[PDB]
Every structure is written in structure tokens, then in C-alpha cells.
Design a protein around this ligand. Structure first.
Ligand code: HEM
Ligand SMILES: CC1(C)[C@@H]2CC[C@@]1(C)C(=O)C2
Ligand SMILES: [K+]
Length: 405
């Protein structure tokens, strides 16, 4: 369970936080992680859980370390070590300088130009899914919307059949919130087993889908290899199937529990983009990290080459030193500070797609189902990992209070 303490780590920095099962999980996952920001907890701690690793607990350190790729490398970006070692996606397992040439290609398939004209289809799917639920007066939000909306958009973009979703979603989840049945390496290899033949098919016969574009792409003017294409497409699948999917459920759970915030967005719909940003701060959900490239003293702590450091994207915006009353949701917050989409050279490329999906969801849901609540007697359970989420979100409403557009 707890790994032996390395010789260079002092006892007074030991805080045995378990990122895959944090002790305060029942309070909400963000709340469970925020225990690391109680006043008695140092800026940088060592946990003996999950093989042993550092955790930066404050936005200042998280930001600094994400900027300093020379000391803090993306070569091994996940805890536990076996996962970070097996992780070879592109561009996320690379540091500058080599990383950068791959970002332009990834931008061609998930960047703003692609969003801007997926626009209509995103809007259409949100409206159709929500209208189908509306007269029922209930739904299981995770399965009925949070999954199918972003995942079907991604499968469309990638030119992949919707009947492949259960398999691909299972595999993706083993990389972020493993159930124990597969190691990271096994889940990754299964994803590659799916992708390799499709990549060769689309290098032989190119389409207009994201996989064809990556597979036939150029990287700073030279052809991408089949291997590189596979390593990029693996990442695109995880972003498509396990990011927005979880975030929408945190947001909708909050709106179900806060009628005042629902009413604010109904009355002042122009605030929806700002609300999206504030929700991205409050219900931030990613916790990746880096590996030390050399011995390095950082904020008075001796780190050794090979040490892993968890740098939770989630924590920066929850830090009271970045945002006053950080657990409070304020759509009028003037400077919404967060690192929800990362920081430094690996800033999320999917963020424009994510914001569109969020904003469309908020607008189109509140237009049709302005009044809803958590199902009677339900206690909402979160789950923690590289990406955190919501296990189930049963919602109810009176259909008489809804509106078919
Ligand atoms: C709420 C939704 C999302 C969040 C919170 C999120 C978060 C992040 C974070 C924290 C990173 C940086 C990881 C690191 O520094 O090691 C990242 C990178 C990336 N994300 Fe997102 N992501 C989201 C949605 C998406 C989607 C929908 C896609 C595409 C379908 C996507 C594609 C990417 C790509 C390609 C990178 C790699 C950038 C690089 O390594 O240079 N993301 N994301
Ligand atoms: C940390 C991430 C959210 C980012 C996009 C998908 C993800 C799980 C990665 O492997 C990089
Ligand atoms: K690796």
C-alpha cells in the first residue's frame, strides 16, 4: 500500500494522499483534493501512495513546474510510474523542442477552424438529446447526455462507428480511473490494437476525418510516421471520450443543486460563456504531472532525478491564493484564475471544442429544462484519478415546467 520512504524525503513532508481514492471523497472530489490546501499542509508534500511521489499543492508551484520543462519533463507524466512509463502519446509525452511540431497537426483536427463548422452538428445533437429526455421528467445524466453528446461528436469527427463506443470508452477509462482489470500498458496496447489497422486503411485511402488527416499529415514539412500517427490518435481518443464527458456531470450536478445559478443564466444568457469559465475553475478535474530530469531544489525541497511530481491542474484555481472564496461559484468573478486546460507548452488543444460543447449544453438544457433537481434520496458519488468524474447523476423534473422548442 504505502511505498517505503526514499532516503532523501523527510518525514515532516509526508502526507499520504491517494489520488485514486482520496480519503475525503464523499465530500465531493474537488473538496477531497482541497484537503491538500489546508493551512497546516506545506506547498510541496510527499505521498507514499501509488508508488510514492511529490505533490505540488498550490497554484504558484503548479504553474512554475509546468513552465519549467527542463527540470520537469513530460516523458513520464502520469502516476503510478508504470503508467507514466507506458504513456507515449503525442504530443503529451514529449518536451520542447520536439513536442512543438506536433501541435500544429493536432490543431488541424481539433482546433478552432474544426470547431467553427462542427458548430451546426454540435448544436443539433445537443437539442435532439435534450428534447428526447425533456418529456420523461427524469434521466441518468451520465449515460443519457454527458457520455453520448461529446462522444458522438468525437466519433463523427474521427469517422469511427458509434457501435465502437462501449469498447473504446472502457479502454480510455482504464487509463484514467483503472478498475484494476488492466494495467495502463494493457489498456494502451488495446487502444493501439484498435487504431493500427484503421490508420493503415486511411493512409492507403485517405478520407476527411481526423484520423485520415493525422495519418496523412506533415510535421514541420516532413511526413508523419505510422507510429507517430497512432500515438497522436490515441491521445485524441482519450480527450474525446474522457474529458468533457466528466466535466458536464460536475456542472449539471451543481446546477441541479443551485436554482439561483440556473435562474441567473436563464435571465441573463449573455453570462453563459463567463459561467462556463467559472465552472471550469470550480469543477476542474485533471491531475497529471512530470518527472524530474535532474536533482533540483525547488521551494526549499530536495527533489532527485527520477522522482515523480503530481502537478494537479485541478488545484490551481481552487487555491485561495489564486481566487478568494474558491469553493464559491460566482459567475461575475472578475479574474477567474485556473489551469484547468493545463499550463505551459502543453496547453490543451481541445479547449475550444470543450468550451463549445459546454456552452451549447448550458444554453440548450436551460432553454428546455429550466427547473430540475437531484433525484429523491440520491447521494451523488464522485470518482478520482487522472481525470475525475461523477459515478451517476439521477435528475428529476416536472415536465409541465419544461419547454419544447
Ligand atoms: C474539459 C475538457 C478538457 C480538459 C479539462 C482538458 C485538459 C487538458 C490538459 C490539462 C492538458 C495538458 C496535459 C499535460 O500538461 O500533460 C491537455 C492537453 C491536450 N488536450 Fe485537452 N482537455 C479537455 C478536452 C480535450 C478534448 C475534447 C480534446 C480533443 C478531442 C483534447 C485534446 C488535447 C490535446 C491534443 C492535448 C495535447 C497538447 C500537447 O501535449 O501539446 N482535450 N488537455
Ligand atoms: C491529461 C489529459 C486530460 C490531457 C488530454 C487527455 C488526458 C487524459 C491526457 O493524456 C492529456
Ligand atoms: K513514457
Amino acid at each position: 500500500n504505502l511505498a517505503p520512504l526514499p532516503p532523501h524525503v523527510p518525514e515532516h513532508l509526508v502526507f499520504d494522499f491517494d489520488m485514486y481514492n482520496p480519503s475525503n471523497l464523499s465530500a465531493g472530489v474537488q473538496e477531497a483534493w482541497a484537503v491538500l490546501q489546508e493551512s497546516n499542509v506545506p506547498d510541496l508534500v510527499w505521498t507514499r501512495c501509488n508508488g510514492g511521489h511529490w505533490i505540488a499543492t498550490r497554484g504558484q508551484l503548479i504553474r512554475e513546474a509546468y513552465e519549467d520543462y527542463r527540470h520537469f519533463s513530460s516523458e513520464c507524466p502520469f502516476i503510478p510510474r508504470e503508467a507514466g512509463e507506458a504513456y507515449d502519446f503525442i504530443p503529451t509525452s514529449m518536451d520542447p523542442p520536439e513536442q512543438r511540431q506536433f501541435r500544429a497537426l493536432a490543431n488541424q483536427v481539433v482546433g478552432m477552424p474544426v470547431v467553427d463548422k462542427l458548430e451546426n452538428r454540435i448544436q443539433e445533437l445537443a437539442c435532439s438529446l435534450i428534447e428526447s429526455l425533456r418529456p420523461q421528467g427524469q434521466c441518468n445524466f451520465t449515460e443519457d447526455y454527458a457520455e453520448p453528446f461529446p462522444i458522438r461528436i468525437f466519433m463523427l469527427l474521427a469517422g469511427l462507428p458509434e457501435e465502437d463506443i462501449p469498447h473504446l470508452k472502457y479502454l480510455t477509462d482504464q487509463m484514467t480511473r483503472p478498475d484494476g482489470s488492466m494495467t495502463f500498458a494493457e489498456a494502451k496496447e488495446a487502444l493501439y490494437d484498435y487504431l493500427i489497422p484503421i490508420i493503415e486503411q486511411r493512409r492507403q485511402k485517405p478520407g476527411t476525418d481526423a484520423i485520415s488527416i493525422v495519418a496523412n499529415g506533415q510535421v514541420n514539412g516532413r511526413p508523419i510516421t505510422s507510429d507517430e500517427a497512432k500515438r497522436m490518435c490515441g491521445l485524441l481518443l482519450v480527450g474525446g471520450l474522457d474529458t468533457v464527458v466528466n466535466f458536464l456531470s460536475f456542472s449539471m450536478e451543481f446546477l441541479a443543486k443551485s436554482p439561483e445559478h440556473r435562474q441567473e443564466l436563464i435571465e441573463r444568457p449573455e453570462r453563459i460563456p463567463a459561467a462556463c469559465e467559472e465552472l471550469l475553475r470550480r469543477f476542474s478535474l485533471v491531475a497529471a504531472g512530470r518527472i524530474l530530469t535532474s536533482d533540483y531544489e525547488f521551494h526549499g525541497v530536495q527533489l532527485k532525478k527520477g522522482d515523480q511530481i503530481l502537478l494537479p491542474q485541478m488545484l490551481s484555481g481552487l487555491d485561495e491564493r489564486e481566487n478568494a472564496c474558491p469553493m464559491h461559484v460566482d459567475f461575475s468573478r472578475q479574474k477567474v484564475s485556473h489551469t484547468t486546460f493545463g499550463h505551459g507548452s502543453h496547453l490543451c488543444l481541445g479547449q475550444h471544442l470543450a468550451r463549445r460543447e459546454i456552452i451549447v449544453t448550458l444554453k440548450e438544457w436551460l432553454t428546455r429544462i429550466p427547473d430540475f433537481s437531484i433525484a429523491p434520496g440520491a447521494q451523488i458519488q464522485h470518482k478520482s484519478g487522472i481525470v475525475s468524474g461523477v459515478q451517476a447523476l439521477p435528475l428529476v423534473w416536472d415536465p409541465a415546467t419544461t419547454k419544447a422548442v
